[PDB]
Amino acid sequence: GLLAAQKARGLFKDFFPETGTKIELPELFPQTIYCGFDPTADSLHVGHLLALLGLFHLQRAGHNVIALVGGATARLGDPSGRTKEREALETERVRANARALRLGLEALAANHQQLFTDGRSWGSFTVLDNSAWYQKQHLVDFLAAVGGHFRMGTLLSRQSVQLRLKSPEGMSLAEFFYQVLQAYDFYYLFQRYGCRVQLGGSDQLGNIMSGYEFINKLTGEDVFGITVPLITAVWLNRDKTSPFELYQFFVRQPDDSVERYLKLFTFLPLPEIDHIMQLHVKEPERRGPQKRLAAEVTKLVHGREGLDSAKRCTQAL
Amino acid sequence: GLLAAQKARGLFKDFFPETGTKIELPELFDRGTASFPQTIYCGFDPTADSLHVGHLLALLGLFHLQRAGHNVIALVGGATARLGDPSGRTKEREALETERVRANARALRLGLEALAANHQQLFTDGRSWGSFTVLDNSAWYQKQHLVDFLAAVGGHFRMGTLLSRQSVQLRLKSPEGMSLAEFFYQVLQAYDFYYLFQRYGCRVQLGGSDQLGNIMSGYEFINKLTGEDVFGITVPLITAVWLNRDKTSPFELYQFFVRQPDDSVERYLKLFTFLPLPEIDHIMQLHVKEPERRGPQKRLAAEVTKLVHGREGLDSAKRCTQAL
Ligand SMILES: Nc1ncnc2c1ncn2[C@@H]1O[C@H](COS(=O)(=O)NC(=O)[C@@H](N)Cc2ccc(O)cc2)[C@@H](O)[C@H]1O
Ligand SMILES: Nc1ncnc2c1ncn2[C@@H]1O[C@H](COS(=O)(=O)NC(=O)[C@@H](N)Cc2ccc(O)cc2)[C@@H](O)[C@H]1O
Incomplete structure (x- = not known):
């Protein structure tokens, strides 16, 4: 329910x-x-x-x-x-x-x-x-x-x-x-x-x-x-916190918190979060949970356009 | 002062x-x-x-x-x-x-x-x-x-x-x-x-x-x-008697004051009237000699009735008081 x-x-x-x-x-x-x-x-x-x-x-x-x-x-x-x-x-x-x-x-x-x-x-x-x-x-x-x-x-x-x-x-x-x-x-x-x-x-x-x-x-x-x-400076308006900074805030979340954040901040089904987490144990290096968390939230507050600049910027760097 | x-x-x-x-x-x-x-x-x-x-x-x-x-x-x-x-x-x-x-x-x-x-x-x-x-x-x-x-x-x-x-x-x-x-x-x-x-x-x-x-x-x-x-x-x-004539008549107002007990009349005279204190003292002294006259009470009743209902009100009040 x-x-x-x-x-x-x-x-x-x-x-x-x-x-x-x-x-x-x-x-x-x-x-x-x-x-x-x-x-x-x-x-x-x-x-x-x-x-x-x-x-x-x-x-x-x-x-x-x-x-x-x-x-x-x-x-x-x-x-x-x-x-x-x-x-x-x-x-x-x-x-x-x-x-x-x-x-x-x-x-x-x-x-x-x-x-x-x-x-x-x-x-x-x-x-x-x-x-x-x-x-x-x-x-x-x-x-x-x-x-x-x-x-x-x-x-x-x-x-x-x-x-x-x-x-x-x-x-x-x-x-x-x-x-x-x-x-x-x-x-x-x-x-x-x-x-x-x-x-x-x-x-x-x-x-x-x-x-x-x-x-x-x-x-x-x-x-x-x-x-x-x-949950305990990260604004939703692009003129105070750019999509890149909002994205980085989420992408840098600790492994110990990343799962709770996925549940709280995204619409991803619980069974999919389980998968992302189990996949993580197997590939810590990819930072899959964090990458998924950052993408979902950034797309929500700044749309695809914002998500795109956010990823392209992090990648370039 | x-x-x-x-x-x-x-x-x-x-x-x-x-x-x-x-x-x-x-x-x-x-x-x-x-x-x-x-x-x-x-x-x-x-x-x-x-x-x-x-x-x-x-x-x-x-x-x-x-x-x-x-x-x-x-x-x-x-x-x-x-x-x-x-x-x-x-x-x-x-x-x-x-x-x-x-x-x-x-x-x-x-x-x-x-x-x-x-x-x-x-x-x-x-x-x-x-x-x-x-x-x-x-x-x-x-x-x-x-x-x-x-x-x-x-x-x-x-x-x-x-x-x-x-x-x-x-x-x-x-x-x-x-x-x-x-x-x-x-x-x-x-x-x-x-x-x-x-x-x-x-x-x-x-x-x-x-x-x-x-x-x-x-x-x-x-x-x-x-x-x-x-x-x-x-x-x-102080210790309902209204000031509005059609709710409480001048006589009724007048009565509330004139029926006041001697033990309180002097205080009421000081509080409710403009009479100089020496006069109020004299009034209380005449009353101790001729209690029956109820001088203090009548003086008090007249002063307030006149302030609340004017001379006309006091006269009417007095007509009724005399009648009784
Ligand atoms: N760090 C945080 N974690 C989770 N939730 C948070 C939060 N910081 C704020 N919130 C929630 O988001 C809203 C907080 O924003 S707020 O602008 O500080 N909330 C308020 O001041 C409310 N009193 C506004 C309000 C609510 C109802 C009314 O009829 C009128 C006004 C509240 O629901 C608050 O509990
Ligand atoms: N039995 C009584 N003996 C002596 N004084 C009396 C009294 N009954 C009432 N009063 C006084 O005469 C006024 C009483 O009238 S009241 O309508 O009950 N007064 C009030 O309720 C005030 N709060 C009205 C008020 C006062 C100031 C304002 O800015 C606004 C309103 C007060 O000054 C009260 O102390």
Whole structure:
């Protein structure tokens, strides 16, 4: 099964709520799944790709997926997993990054659709920007509508917010309110698109939790979250990281990690990865696993043209 | 000095910061030193379509400041009442409809201007008074988008100071807990202060003792952001009798005061009226000799009824009282 396969690959790390309450994810798995991306930079990087890949897998299986650009949330800054408060970002810069992210996400989905077809009937891929609905949201109207549905006790206790909340210098009201906006986003997408699932890296669990808890509080509806593992400077935009550098980053992965990366970053069937690995024991010199990993990812973010310059450049050298 | 006098009456129970400021509150109020006149505001939330006797004490505080030559603003919380102030309570108020709050706010603006009118026409004292203005915070919040607000001032409000307010610490402990909207309420009141300070040069906020925390959040936010000094003043909390004639008649209002117990009448005379303290003392001495006359109570009832309902209201009140 889809969930089963991704869990097996290691791409889907966990499913929530654990209780699953009324139902439980395996059961509803055309669903709509979304994942947000905050434009703190004018380019996505290799880590964000893992979350995007999670969406692609669901789309390939027939589900509709939404890649949300956080044009409004990036103005505040996600405190999840952070020790220090973020340097304030100019609104103008945030909107410029947002426009760039939207184009970046569409270019990736374009490469996906054109170079990784499998003849299956895929769901849709849509890029939205939360600033679309926040620019119409007035302060007090928002607080009067949904403010009573959030409990300070729950907000203050999220694990994701403890690093900043419990710091010696304290967290700002903006940092604290961030999770409310992400929770609202989930609720908004649930109401306008039937979105019942939100995917993100494990550092996003808290924000996702407040979202499904929020929605289950207003409606006895059940919605879920899926996290992807966090893998630990390599950008997806050619003007910051050329195809050659992106390719080299993957091609130089250690033998001990190369197999996990093939599972996480490519669409290659598990049985084929087994083959590439067994073939490797027999021919360490060819660096087959690494060459295959680099090719798949580079083709995904920079197309054939990019893959070609990438290989030709490495070969020449 | 204005502050000493009102402290003497028991009306201004507290004011702060006490020291550690370029110029202290007393000198800021002083006609001769530093600036003059100052601008002071007090917020009133239209959770009902009428003010009541408790709100009157806060209003009286403004009146006293206005009589000393300062400008006073009576703020109707058309936006804040949509949420509800959690201060001094353990129960989560059940919010009213936007439409209802809008109508209440309009009635309040009218009730406040009516009291101000009675004050200026019936309680002149020969001095040159400052102005009295009514504003509604919905005027600026209706132009505030959620994210623009959080981005603009969200970084200057610190969860630490916000979580520390006793009122807030009280609700977070209660078995019922606390909603996000009740928590955010103090941010709006704090912002209101900053906004009036910036636009009108308002440096003082007045409120009942339950407003201490909310006024403090204003002080912190303003100081943090501008390095400027602002102040708060609180009046005593007193123990529903409405100020709106069609909800509570002049006679009924009059009654609430005249039926007051001797053990409390003198305090009410000091808090609710403009009578000089020496006169209030004399009144209490005549009463100890002729308790039956209920002089203090009648004096108190007449003063307030006249301020709330004018001479016409007091006459009607007296007609009914005589009849009985
Ligand atoms: N190194 C990494 N490994 C794996 N996943 C990673 C990663 N670095 C980032 N990610 C994932 O990719 C996304 C991270 O990008 S982010 O722009 O840092 N994510 C965020 O800030 C989200 N709060 C954005 C958001 C989400 C939902 C909303 O409704 C609104 C905004 C998250 O899903 C994050 O978990
Ligand atoms: N029983 C009572 N005795 C003495 N004073 C009383 C009282 N009942 C109310 N008051 C005072 O008169 C006002 C009470 O009215 S209230 O509508 O309940 N006040 C509030 O809720 C404020 N938070 C309104 C507010 C204040 C400032 C703003 O910028 C915005 C709104 C406060 O100053 C309160 O302390």
